[PDB]
Amino acid sequence: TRPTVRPRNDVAHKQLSAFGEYVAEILPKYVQQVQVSCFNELEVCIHPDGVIPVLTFLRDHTNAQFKSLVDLTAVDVPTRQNRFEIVYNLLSLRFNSRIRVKTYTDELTPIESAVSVFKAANWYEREIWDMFGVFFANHPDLRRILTDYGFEGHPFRKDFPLSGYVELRYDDEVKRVVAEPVELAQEFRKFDLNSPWEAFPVYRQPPE
Amino acid sequence: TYKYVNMQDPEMDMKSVTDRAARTLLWTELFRGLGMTLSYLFREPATINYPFEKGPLSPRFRGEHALRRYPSGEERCIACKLCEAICPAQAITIEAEPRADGSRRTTRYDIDMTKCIYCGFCQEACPVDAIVEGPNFEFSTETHEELLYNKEKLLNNGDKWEAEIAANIQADYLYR
Amino acid sequence: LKKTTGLVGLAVCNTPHERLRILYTKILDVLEEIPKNAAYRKYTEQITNEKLAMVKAEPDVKKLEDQLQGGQLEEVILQAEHELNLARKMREWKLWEPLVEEPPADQWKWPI
Amino acid sequence: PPLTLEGIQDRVLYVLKLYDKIDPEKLSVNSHFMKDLGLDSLDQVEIIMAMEDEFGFEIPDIDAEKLMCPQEIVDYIADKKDVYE
Amino acid sequence: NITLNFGPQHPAAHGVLRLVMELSGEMVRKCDPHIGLLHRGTEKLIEYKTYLQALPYFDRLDYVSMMCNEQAYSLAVEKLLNIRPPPRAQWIRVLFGEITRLLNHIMAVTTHALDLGAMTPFFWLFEEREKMFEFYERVSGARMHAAYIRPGGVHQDLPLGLMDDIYQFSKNFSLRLDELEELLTNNRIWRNRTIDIGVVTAEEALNYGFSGVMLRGSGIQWDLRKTQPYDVYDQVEFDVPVGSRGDCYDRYLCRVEEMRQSLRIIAQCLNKMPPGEIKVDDAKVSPPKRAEMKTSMESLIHHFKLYTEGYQVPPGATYTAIEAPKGEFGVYLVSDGSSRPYRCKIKAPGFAHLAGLDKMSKGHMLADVVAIIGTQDIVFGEVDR
Amino acid sequence: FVKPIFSRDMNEAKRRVRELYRAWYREVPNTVHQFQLDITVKMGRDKVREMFMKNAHVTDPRVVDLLVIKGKIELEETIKVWKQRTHVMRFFHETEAPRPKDFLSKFYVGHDP
Numbered sequence A: 001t002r003p004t005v006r007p008r009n010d011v012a013h014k015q016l017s018a019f020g021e022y023v024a025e026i027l028p029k030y031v032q033q034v035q036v037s038c039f040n041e042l043e044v045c046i047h048p049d050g051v052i053p054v055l056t057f058l059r060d061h062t063n064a065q066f067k068s069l070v071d072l073t074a075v076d077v078p079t080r081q082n083r084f085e086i087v088y089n090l091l092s093l094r095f096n097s098r099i100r101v102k103t104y105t106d107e108l109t110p111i112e113s114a115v116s117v118f119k120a121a122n123w124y125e126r127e128i129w130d131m132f133g134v135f136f137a138n139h140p141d142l143r144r145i146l147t148d149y150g151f152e153g154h155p156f157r158k159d160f161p162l163s164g165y166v167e168l169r170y171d172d173e174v175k176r177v178v179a180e181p182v183e184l185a186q187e188f189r190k191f192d193l194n195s196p197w198e199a200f201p202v203y204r205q206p207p208e
Numbered sequence B: 001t002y003k004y005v006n007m008q009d010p011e012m013d014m015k016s017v018t019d020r021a022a023r024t025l026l027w028t029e030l031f032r033g034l035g036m037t038l039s040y041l042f043r044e045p046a047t048i049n050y051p052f053e054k055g056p057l058s059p060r061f062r063g064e065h066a067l068r069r070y071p072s073g074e075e076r077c078i079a080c081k082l083c084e085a086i087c088p089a090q091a092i093t094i095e096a097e098p099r100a101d102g103s104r105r106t107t108r109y110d111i112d113m114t115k116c117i118y119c120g121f122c123q124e125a126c127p128v129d130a131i132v133e134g135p136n137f138e139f140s141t142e143t144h145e146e147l148l149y150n151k152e153k154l155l156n157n158g159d160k161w162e163a164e165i166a167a168n169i170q171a172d173y174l175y176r
Numbered sequence C: 001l002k003k004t005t006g007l008v009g010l011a012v013c014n015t016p017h018e019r020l021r022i023l024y025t026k027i028l029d030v031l032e033e034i035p036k037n038a039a040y041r042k043y044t045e046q047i048t049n050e051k052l053a054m055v056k057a058e059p060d061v062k063k064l065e066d067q068l069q070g071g072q073l074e075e076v077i078l079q080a081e082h083e084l085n086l087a088r089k090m091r092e093w094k095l096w097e098p099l100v101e102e103p104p105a106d107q108w109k110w111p112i
Numbered sequence D: 001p002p003l004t005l006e007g008i009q010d011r012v013l014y015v016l017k018l019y020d021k022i023d024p025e026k027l028s029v030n031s032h033f034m035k036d037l038g039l040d041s042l043d044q045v046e047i048i049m050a051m052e053d054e055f056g057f058e059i060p061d062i063d064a065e066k067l068m069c070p071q072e073i074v075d076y077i078a079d080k081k082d083v084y085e
Numbered sequence E: 001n002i003t004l005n006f007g008p009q010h011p012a013a014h015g016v017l018r019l020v021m022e023l024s025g026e027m028v029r030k031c032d033p034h035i036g037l038l039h040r041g042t043e044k045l046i047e048y049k050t051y052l053q054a055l056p057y058f059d060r061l062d063y064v065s066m067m068c069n070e071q072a073y074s075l076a077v078e079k080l081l082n083i084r085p086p087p088r089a090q091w092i093r094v095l096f097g098e099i100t101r102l103l104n105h106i107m108a109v110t111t112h113a114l115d116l117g118a119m120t121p122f123f124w125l126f127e128e129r130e131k132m133f134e135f136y137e138r139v140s141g142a143r144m145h146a147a148y149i150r151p152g153g154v155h156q157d158l159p160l161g162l163m164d165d166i167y168q169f170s171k172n173f174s175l176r177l178d179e180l181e182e183l184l185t186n187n188r189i190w191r192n193r194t195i196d197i198g199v200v201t202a203e204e205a206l207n208y209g210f211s212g213v214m215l216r217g218s219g220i221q222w223d224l225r226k227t228q229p230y231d232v233y234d235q236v237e238f239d240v241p242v243g244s245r246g247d248c249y250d251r252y253l254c255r256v257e258e259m260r261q262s263l264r265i266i267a268q269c270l271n272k273m274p275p276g277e278i279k280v281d282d283a284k285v286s287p288p289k290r291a292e293m294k295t296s297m298e299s300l301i302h303h304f305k306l307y308t309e310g311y312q313v314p315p316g317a318t319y320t321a322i323e324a325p326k327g328e329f330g331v332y333l334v335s336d337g338s339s340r341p342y343r344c345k346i347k348a349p350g351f352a353h354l355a356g357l358d359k360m361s362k363g364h365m366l367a368d369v370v371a372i373i374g375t376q377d378i379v380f381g382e383v384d385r
Numbered sequence F: 001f002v003k004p005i006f007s008r009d010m011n012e013a014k015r016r017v018r019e020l021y022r023a024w025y026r027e028v029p030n031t032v033h034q035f036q037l038d039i040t041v042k043m044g045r046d047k048v049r050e051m052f053m054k055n056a057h058v059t060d061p062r063v064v065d066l067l068v069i070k071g072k073i074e075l076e077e078t079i080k081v082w083k084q085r086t087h088v089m090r091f092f093h094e095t096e097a098p099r100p101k102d103f104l105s106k107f108y109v110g111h112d113p
Ligand SMILES: CCCCCCCCCCCC(=O)SCCNC(=O)CCNC(=O)[C@H](O)C(C)(C)COP(=O)(O)O
Pocket: D040, D041, D042, D044, F010, F014, F017, F020, F028, F031, F044, F047, F048, F051, F052, F055, F056, F057, F058, F059, F063, F064, F065, F067, F068, F070, F071, F074, F088, F091
């Protein structure tokens, strides 16, 4: 229960918890869950219409100066209609604390841009615009990062093939590089390594 | 626990001052620093005389693949097809089929060095210690096709190097 | 007084104590027009008050950064200023209505 | 420089001559470019911008919300060129 | 003004940037850093692979330091599996984490010197980086992109021969840094090229999330070791450089100090490695010795499984920062509990720096800009991905 | 129901597209000369008319306005003399074989759907 096991830090869990109810007090209007795992990792909801007003508050001291948007990590789950799950990782430097505060959005919901508030999201912007289509409040430019020029796709939508539909090559008489239909050789020979028989009864969503 | 860099304040003392202005003029330290590069002229140069000399390599070293045999002269491969399940780039392709003798045997083992990333997983993964990431490294080709190896070429590679490969394994086997 | 703040963006502002009392009286001045009911207001009260008395606890700039248990509070005047713009922001958020709109249960239903 | 009105309409119709999508017979003093002429909206934009390129001034598409008759084009020109004599 | 695309092609561009400038006479106005010329898109490529398969990807982002990347993965995977490694593995991860740090800083130093046209240190010190690649080769069979650090810990035990020669290796190295001490550190031309260039106020740094020496140069003291001694760093003695002016000269001297600092640490890690497994006891995560798998059944069974479907993380999506020499490093896992990740974003420390460069660009002449890329230790591989 | 991107109802959106067409329709020769396209310029304008036709089934104003957002964003890369001649030619796919919509030929070709 020790040589392999990583010890559970109850203390920080206690402090983060208590601060968690503290914040739960402070912004009832958007804050929801106050998740607190044994990893010492706190988490909190925000409604997307509540993106900016919460985040600004975060930067300003209460007992945690949530300075430096370290990340706007993003996840797409097709099942939920609110398929997008934008996440604000954060770190109050003065208090050496860390927190994860996320949201959700639909394909045509103009979620608020923290560009005015953090500016670090001038690109967390355009990536998460481009890879997805998560339209953003008001940004100086929504021009694509990463993906090419005429490129139409939105990879990381967890949709359409990992190769994509596009596969460019130089061509002769046109004297120029041209995009072409894929035609993969050998093909990504995907292995379904999923295991029937649950190893974790403690979890397990009920059949209901 | 932190340390300031620099920060230190230079002396106003007249000896030290006129010395610094003497650096500002007569350059002094440049030559001192300059003098240092001269020290290299007198050192012996570090080039290995390739290819009549070659760089040191540990026995572990990863390189060209080769299938290899039993001491009896049967091929070690049993087509367990887990090395196909591991090759992170999935370079490997295997069609296991029965031998007329009935033994499991690959009919078309093959791998392309174009997609191989030489992580050398398969050297570790194989239960029968069939395939081996051999010592050889120098084998650049005129054409792409010469890279897409059949089981055949790999067997040949296990033929030329088997003394060597088995020798290195003889050096290494305890660690695994 | 120590020469050089050390930090790059920060700059010295002599007689910090007075400037801080300015900030205490002013963020107090804005919290007062915020309704008592808003959950933030009582705690920002606790903060401005306990910190103001805490500045009063000692005179010199020197041990003052010990009394608040923070190195160079010469920065926290700036943080207090963020706190001031924040408290200015509290007004347009109004008094805090508990929650608005809720997730379909599928949201936050982790795993999947 | 005089900007005589009838010659303005001559100018616009000549632009319609150079213009492709309209039939030369379909050319007329009144027939609407949305409600009469069968040319689509992109053709609306096409003539409206060719014409404004002739007149050398921007025509907001709010006037395309107006437009109506070509007679209201020359009419607007009377309200635009403001010579109207 | 005159619109102008720059790299990749410039040696200064490092084969990656295309930061177009709309130059005036030579003073910059517009100066946008385009990227996605290297974007390997590994985020989806991580998703369709067993967690043991993900491991190479991190050697593939930080080209130079390598072991630190994999350690950045082993920490983040062992968290969800709640697994705590045998101590020897951690002394190793620190040992080669620091030797990777020597490789990384030697890289940044000598290349930054090359853009300043110094030429020589390059050849004075890669003579050493081959001396270290001989070592990663002695422990991995690969000169670089060694996979020797693993989520269970480590592939394999250290060969008996190293323990002496490595000491020998660092028996003389301090002098080799002395030879630089007699160059740029004191040299006149060098100060002018770098003094008072790209100075950054503490707040912009805290806004953009600058980290590492890039904070420590401008005086912010934020650090990912002593604040969170995630491994043996808590036992290790060392001391952290902090800059004053925010001068590139500052950041420079810091990196030289960290190199000294690893000269301090690696001494102690050589001084303190326990005997013990360098792997976890469990065969449900850490695979059996070839000697045992080929007799005992269960060893061969789980052997067969980890090499075919692998260990299963309990479900969860998490994030972990890393003390990369270049800064905070991003490990954003999203795991359904299947060995396949559901998602995995990777924040490069250099991403924020490159986001911040244009702020430092405008109002500076082009040589200042060439100075700036070398200011920030940016290997572009990690940044677009 | 749900809050709109920009335009609400088609006309707030329809206004934006025309702004787009001219924004291309004038820009085209500039592109013809910057990249020295061998295409006759009317072909360029025709393609300009065509890409505005592929989006004919659009009916939500959020879809229209999001399409002109992305289309103007493409215009950004065009006007700034970004891209390359090849990228401009990607719209043509001239290297590719013509597709026979006729079912009989579809029979003659291969297994297909
Ligand atoms: C060298 C040149 C390169 C070519 C580049 C091509 C770039 C094209 C950019 C693509 C962006 C879009 O699709 S723009 C998105 C807008 N497209 C739509 O279809 C929205 C709904 N349109 C309608 O409802 C009407 O039928 C309407 C079609 C407007 C007709 O207007 P009228 O009937 O009322 O006159």
